[PDB]
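Schema walkthrough. Field components (list of strings):
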Amino acid sequence: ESRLDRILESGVLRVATTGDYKPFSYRTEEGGYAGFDVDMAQRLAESLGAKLVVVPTSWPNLMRDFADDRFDIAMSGISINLERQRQAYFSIPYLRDGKTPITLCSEEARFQTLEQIDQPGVTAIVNPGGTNEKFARANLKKARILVHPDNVTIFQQIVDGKADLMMTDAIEARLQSRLHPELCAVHPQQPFDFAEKAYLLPRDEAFKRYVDQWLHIAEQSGLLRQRMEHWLEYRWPT
Amino acid sequence: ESRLDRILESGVLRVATTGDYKPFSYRTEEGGYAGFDVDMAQRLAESLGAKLVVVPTSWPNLMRDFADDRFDIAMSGISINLERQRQAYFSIPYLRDGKTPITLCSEEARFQTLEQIDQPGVTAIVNPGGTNEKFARANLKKARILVHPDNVTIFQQIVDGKADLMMTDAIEARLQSRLHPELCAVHPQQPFDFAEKAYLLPRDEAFKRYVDQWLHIAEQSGLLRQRMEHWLEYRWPT
Amino acid sequence: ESRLDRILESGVLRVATTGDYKPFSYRTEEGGYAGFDVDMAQRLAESLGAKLVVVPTSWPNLMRDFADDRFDIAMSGISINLERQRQAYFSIPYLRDGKTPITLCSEEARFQTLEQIDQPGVTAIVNPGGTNEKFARANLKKARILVHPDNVTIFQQIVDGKADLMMTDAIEARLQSRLHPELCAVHPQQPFDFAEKAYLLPRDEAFKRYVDQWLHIAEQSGLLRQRMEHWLEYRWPT
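Field assembly_structure (string):
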């Protein structure tokens, strides 16, 4: 009665992914998938003699989808947080990060501190339902919060002047500062908070143990560092 | 069927504490509580949307109280040891330490090594029922062992000459060398053994996972280092 | 319903060991046992107030013996791998290592890389049923693979010219380069892969927790580093 045994008997691993967060997970117009976490899902599946079955989900529906048992694991640039820990498990962490501003490079100097960001005529854009929204709501008393449903296009909103900044994971701020030359990542090396990425798991001890063992070896063998570099350098569209 | 779910449905977290071990836990004459671990309990409770309910316990009764399910977690400068691990779980560790002497500063040079401590006319004082007593009994063949029930006043016994030394956690030896100017901590940086402080938990996987996740973030965010400093500098009475 | 409780009620710990892998586990002609992991088993048993009961097993039968519940733990220079993780748990790791060549010192320079090893007239010897065999089969397309059932005598096969090399854990390559002066360990410091040694455990959470707690203290107290040195320097026969 571990889903580790179910997966091993099945030969199927159901991996949920949002498809909306480069460099971790991106759903093409074709209807396939790329990125570091999709790449890693194929690896986890293989290690189990299993076929990778990609289950679409979204930031707003992640925990509903989780509660409903639509998937065995979620692999999608997911931050660890305690709200999520209330219901699910996380794997050991594969990345350390934190929220930081991305804004027009000209504006950069305005938005160094949350003191400067949280002001009556400032508009911070966020995608709904995840840690970006949570951070914005927890920390902005005075700035307006513009909820934009499509995270793939959220950075174009900043370019197009529809909002002054977004606070998002610094890895996403660094990459999008490359995909949209107008945008700058603000002190990505000194984020406003601490958070880790990990894989979202059922409350299942044996399956967490297997996943963590697989991830620890991927990490210590350097295979993890190398696939991330590959996906950071990859030719993402905009 | 995790007590994580019970606590979340309840809105109550029952935290056991001894109230007798500054800087971790101190029960006032009023009948309230202070210290690093009480401070941390409030934090754990909050993170869970729960009310902190402080359950009194003592070193002699800790494991009896634990077996009886009087509390959800114990947070009280508790050392990890295998005897305790027989019945309970521990969280990940928040402090590394070890047993070391505290004695009259004049006597300091007599009591550097266990060779010197363990002698026919030496009296080592300990509080009963915990790792201090266990260490003393495990390691003294020749010194007398004076069991003093009130750990709040045990250091005054050394000042008052009722015993020659105590071997206790070096963090408690450093602080009490400050609260009682007559006492010196002996090589606190080189303890006689290795031990960690952690929180005492039921055999409940999901609740340990939540607690460890919360503690790891408290630690990596530096919030842990900062509350300890605050409680080390606090104006404890004697 | 943890085997931690069964062992504590019993006063018995059943430890499986192969007896065929110095410096971890060696079964004498008398029919007793030596090595680092046997030494550690006595320690684990003691910590539990239990008697050590040594259960013989072998690389080919390890997982069959495990599935049949012939033992509570296996302690025998066992590598972590995911195949094994499918069915069992591992403790936290006590050693980091990797596969590397051991060959006649004269030949050393031929067998630096797997490019050089995997050639039509090369014969790599392995013992059956474990990670050495798995590695050899996974990585040799062109070299022949000679399966030798007795790991105690496998290194003498290289001395006797019956095979050109073995790829085995670098700790075993370093020690056998000492026991058989004709053999050299090839870049033991740069193995061909990454692997850890750990103890093989039932899917039992409370018992893993106890074991890991015991091992973490053995490690952090330096007791682990010191017993390994002792068994590396020990006067093994050949």
